[PDB]
Amino acid sequence: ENLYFQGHMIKSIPEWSEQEYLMLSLPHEKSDWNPYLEEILQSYKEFVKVVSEFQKVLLIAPKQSDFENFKDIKNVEFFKCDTNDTWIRDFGAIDIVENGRLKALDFTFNAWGNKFQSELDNAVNSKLFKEKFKEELKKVDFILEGGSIDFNGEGVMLTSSHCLLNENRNSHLNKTQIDTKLKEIFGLKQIIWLENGFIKGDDTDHHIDTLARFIDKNTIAHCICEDEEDEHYLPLQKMKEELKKTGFDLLELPIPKPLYYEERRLGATYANFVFINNALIVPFYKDKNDEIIAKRLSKALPNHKIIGVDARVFLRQNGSLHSSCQNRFKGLR
Numbered sequence: 001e002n003l004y005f006q007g008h009m010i011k012s013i014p015e016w017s018e019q020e021y022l023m024l025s026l027p028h029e030k031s032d033w034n035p036y037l038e039e040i041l042q043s044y045k046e047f048v049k050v051v052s053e054f055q056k057v058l059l060i061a062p063k064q065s066d067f068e069n070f071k072d073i074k075n076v077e078f079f080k081c082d083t084n085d086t087w088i089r090d091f092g093a094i095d096i097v098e099n100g101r102l103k104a105l106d107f108t109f110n111a112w113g114n115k116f117q118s119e120l121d122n123a124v125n126s127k128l129f130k131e132k133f134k135e136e137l138k139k140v141d142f143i144l145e146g147g148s149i150d151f152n153g154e155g156v157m158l159t160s161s162h163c164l165l166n167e168n169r170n171s172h173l174n175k176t177q178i179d180t181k182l183k184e185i186f187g188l189k190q191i192i193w194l195e196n197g198f199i200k201g202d203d204t205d206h207h208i209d210t211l212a213r214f215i216d217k218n219t220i221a222h223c224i225c226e227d228e229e230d231e232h233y234l235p236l237q238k239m240k241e242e243l244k245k246t247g248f249d250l251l252e253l254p255i256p257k258p259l260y261y262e263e264r265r266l267g268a269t270y271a272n273f274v275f276i277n278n279a280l281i282v283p284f285y286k287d288k289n290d291e292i293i294a295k296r297l298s299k300a301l302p303n304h305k306i307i308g309v310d311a312r313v314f315l316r317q318n319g320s321l322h323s324s325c326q327n328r329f330k331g332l333r
């Protein structure tokens, strides 16, 4: 579809497209990771080692000493920059194809409705693209997190109404204004707006990357709850019914049985996985459903190695694997 609008033809890139880097922001002394900084860093080591076997990894941290934990890992690069937190999925630049070339977008990030400090995270993209990539960066005057949106690459996007229409985000516009703006920015034909569904512990106002994800052009993998007494049951059932009306094939990702840290339910979701070259890295929570979701996804993705990575520690700060990384795609810049 050769559509041009105000000088540009735009294509949205799905996660399974070929990538150059996976980018992460390390936990450090002055982040909210402090009370268990070593447990989370041990988990990062595993995550990084697994990804590095398939494609390059870029680690962003505010001190040289933060990199010394990862020094002897193949295909790992380092970049010095100050950070508030580690959730680069939400503040990291987002690639699109603009007139046949890769171009990165730099949306404004306010930490999910100014729930935490966000001034340093906001400036990571400017500095990274100025010092490392030495590459122009498109400023977009619009509050958006990458975790709140999901693409199939044929011009269809997936998102949640509760997040994007929240008064703590872009309150000054309405649904029609927002739906229009995002279609122009990513050159989309369609946006699917999910009214129902959440994961308990999620402090991001119902990010789509905890609920439903495209795994190929035709297939959406989405969360459900097998336990009818769990608060997740009918919210995810209603969400499942919305998803049936889209016409896409569906793959079910049953949530684990409740996990707690300091008498607080953790937001475990198998939807927070990440595509890299030739592999899909999936979060494992040491529930019996780890095996079940791994077999399902693996059978549905015969060109990928599906790899489980222990993601329990990530949940203490209310995100998982996908939340903790950002994809930078391979192509002409």
Ligand SMILES: N=C(N)NCCCCN
Residues within 6 Å of the ligand: 032, 087, 089, 090, 116, 147, 203, 204, 207, 317, 318, 319, 320, 323, 324
């Ligand atoms: N990546 C997300 N969607 N959320 C991360 C939780 C942020 C709370 N410190």
Ligand SMILES: [K+]
Residues within 6 Å of the ligand: 091, 106, 107, 108, 109, 121, 122, 123, 125
């Ligand atoms: K930004």
